[PDB]
Design an enzyme around this catalytic site. Structure first.
Site, PDB file in Angstrom:
ATOM      1  N   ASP D  58       0.855  -1.199   0.000  1.00 40.54           N
ATOM      2  CA  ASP D  58       0.000   0.000   0.000  1.00 40.54           C
ATOM      3  C   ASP D  58       0.881   1.235   0.000  1.00 40.54           C
ATOM      4  O   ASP D  58       0.664   2.158  -0.774  1.00 40.54           O
ATOM      5  CB  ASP D  58      -0.925   0.039   1.219  1.00 40.54           C
ATOM      6  CG  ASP D  58      -1.894  -1.112   1.261  1.00 40.54           C
ATOM      7  OD1 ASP D  58      -2.056  -1.832   0.230  1.00 40.54           O
ATOM      8  OD2 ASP D  58      -2.521  -1.283   2.325  1.00 40.54           O
ATOM      9  N   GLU D 171      -9.178  -1.421   3.750  1.00 38.25           N
ATOM     10  CA  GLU D 171      -8.633  -1.040   5.012  1.00 38.25           C
ATOM     11  C   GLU D 171      -9.678  -0.493   5.944  1.00 38.25           C
ATOM     12  O   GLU D 171      -9.676  -0.838   7.060  1.00 38.25           O
ATOM     13  CB  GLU D 171      -7.468  -0.098   4.840  1.00 38.25           C
ATOM     14  CG  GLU D 171      -6.911   0.376   6.106  1.00 38.25           C
ATOM     15  CD  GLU D 171      -6.835   1.869   6.149  1.00 38.25           C
ATOM     16  OE1 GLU D 171      -5.717   2.379   6.222  1.00 38.25           O
ATOM     17  OE2 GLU D 171      -7.878   2.544   6.090  1.00 38.25           O
TER      18      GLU D 171
END
Lengths: 230, 269, 230, 269
Positions: D58, D171
């Protein structure tokens, strides 16, 4: 950078960028059901004109009162034919689709003509005859609303409206078509099992506008003009 | 809901929601309600406004305010006119007196009995029938109020104008109890006002006490429930409620219940 | 015609045009209570600096956990002193007002100085020393937030914030001061029983702005400038 | 509530809330996430952005996107720079490799162990003490993540820039389960993305599979609950959920529960 409004209007009018008919039907049948229950109401009421919007709203309402009765909560849906005199198979066709608990027919011409006549006798004058026709068209639409309220009130019920977002843009108490576009009203009806029956502004153009569907620039500008111009 | 707001707190708060101000001065609420009507007209392009004059104080007051607003507009140069309507149900002293106080640019008298009676008959023809005297009364009552609204909209249509409405905050609260609709109007110059505040506005506008006191049947019918037992609230109790004046606790608790039941249905969706 | 924004900001920031302290206290104690209950939480946490905002937020939170325990629901409020070294009687005074279930003292200087030092060793350089002080001020404020989260997490609790509308304009998880102006924070504390302890923009000016209080034109224009300039 | 929306319907709908689009094309999501970062910078006046490079995908992806954004800005003429940060907790192969792929204008290495350890000790001094090995682990875990955020904010402060954040929709859903916070960042170029979509974006940006696969302890710690039994959701189940892919019903029902419990607390007020 105008695309700001377009999206601002769709949200304010409640148009979701995606749509699933099954999902919507379910959601809107429940809206209606909760509403009548929460308010201690026993009936709801809609004029059935043969038009797709009232066919759709009405079938949702029939399904709502059926879902309540399964609950043990009593409720009825009263469909109304509201002719202006002996003018009609479209509404009968709509009726055969809605399958309402009840159907009343109420002729609005006598009330409408009596209002027009009293206005005249009262000295309301029109520059043109066309203008009188416009005034009468609106009287007719309003008389139709009175008939519906009359029944809703006598029956401890409420009036269903056919309002939706495409309609607000282009053109009751409970509005189960809120947030929908025109093609989405049509698609909701199709999936409920219905058969298959402006200044140059169209419903396709409004539906595109409200739907985020990437569409021509000019056209979009056009739809925004007409809306603001109202 | 570990939160238990005080009734006085709940009243505060409803009142702000409805636009009842904490203090009221009639002299300049008048001045400002006028201008509001005017500015709305220009801003929209409209040249006329319309109102049914019932003989009752809310219509007398909204009426007078509208006539002063156009009289002002003119001064601003922007032409416009006010059409008062007398709307009898067949064959009234109250209304004629109110008209004399409103002094409208123009008055039309339109009989709503033929239309009302025709709607009731056609409803019976269609199956809303075998009504007893009170059920018919109650049905006829709504019809008449809404036929009156139709008359005003027609004129307004005809004249590129808007319908002045009499709605106010006390009336809104009454509506929680009655559920009376008439369909609504376009411009609400009395908005935020309580019943006694409308009366005070009217006296400021020059209404005499006899005029203030008039209660035509057309206004009285609007305070009844949809069909014919109903908790009887008075406007005086509603006004005390909204204005936060000392009053009966039970009474105020009732009004909360009713506002609550309404607050929800509006939540749904 | 700018008065449009002013009112638009107050609403967006949630400032009511009237205020009753008793009413607000009650409302905000309940907010906190419902929150911890609904979320199955057992504690809440706030740094107590001696400033009126954290004194107020903290006393509301103590009252909230006391209202829950009366309910049979268990919950504690943990007050934190968070000094930067041996610098303090204002916080002790605040503490004596808050009367928290618990008070922990956590010195943030070692963590803050260790962060500053590591930044330097890492090659972060400032044109001026004043700039280093500014950077350290923010490190300190953030270290203080870490200490609070550390305790909230170890305890299945949450962190109380002191945010309010005057603050948003001028300058956690649960914000019981939301919607308030500065003078209204002060008044809420007074009624809870507390004793009686920018570019030229003041809290009075912000409070007026947000409160609808009819105030000078220029000044208003001024406050609107500063806010937009942010 | 006479309304019973289908799980598939509920998934639709959450997904739109979180900005997961129905289709995904990596080639131009890249193009558009870049421009977004750029335009935000000018529009704000800012000249720098900052990001901690953990070694995990990420941050590798948000990182690369940021470096291309400034590289673009420059072209637009508008000067700006990207500062990558390596943020070890004392004495890592994953991070060095990620850095090589990001190719930042500038890299600062800042040790967060001294600050982290000092905060933990002072917390123990203050009474958060007698922690067993796992309780200390879990406490230390949050502290480290938030100390890393402090480092990035300091640099950003120092340089009139903003902190790039790695937040994405998958997330967010993970967060319903874990409740892990780090305080947040300023600009979220990965917003709306699911976990597999971030990986696809990265491959489009030229990441090799070995880089895609790296999972540093600093990223792994963020997938744990606040304290040390927890329902174990995986990102793969979350992605299937949000993307509306065929998957396990029980699993999807769990995710709904968790999103529900969150939807409320946000309602309160």
């Amino acid at each position: 950078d105008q695309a700001a409004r377009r999206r601002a209007i769709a949200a304010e009018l409640h148009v979701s960028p995606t749509f699933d008919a099954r999902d919507e039907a379910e959601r809107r049948i429940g809206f209606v059901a909760d509403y009548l229950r929460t308010a201690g109401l026993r009936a709801c009421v809609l004029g059935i004109s043969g038009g797709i919007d009232s066919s759709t709203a009405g079938r949702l309402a029939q399904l709502a009162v059926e879902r309540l009765r399964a609950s043990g909560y009593d409720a009825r849906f009263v469909a109304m034919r509201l002719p202006y005199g002996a003018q009609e198979a479209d509404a009968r066709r709509a009726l055969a689709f809605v399958r309402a608990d009840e159907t009343l027919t109420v002729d609005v011409k006598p009330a409408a003509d009596a209002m027009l006549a009293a206005l005249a006798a009262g000295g309301l004058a029109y520059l043109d005859h066309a203008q009188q026709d416009f005034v009468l068209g609106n009287i007719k639409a309003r008389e139709r609303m009175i008939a519906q309220y009359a029944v809703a009130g006598a029956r401890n019920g409420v009036v269903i409206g056919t309002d939706h977002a495409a309609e607000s843009v282009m053109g009751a108490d409970v509005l189960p078509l809120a947030g929908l576009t025109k093609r989405r009203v049509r698609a909701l009806a199709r999936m409920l099992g219905a058969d298959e029956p402006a200044y140059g502004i169209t419903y396709e153009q409004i539906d595109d506008f409200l739907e985020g569907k990437p569409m021509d620039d000019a056209v979009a500008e056009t739809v925004l003009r007409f809306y603001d111009a109202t």
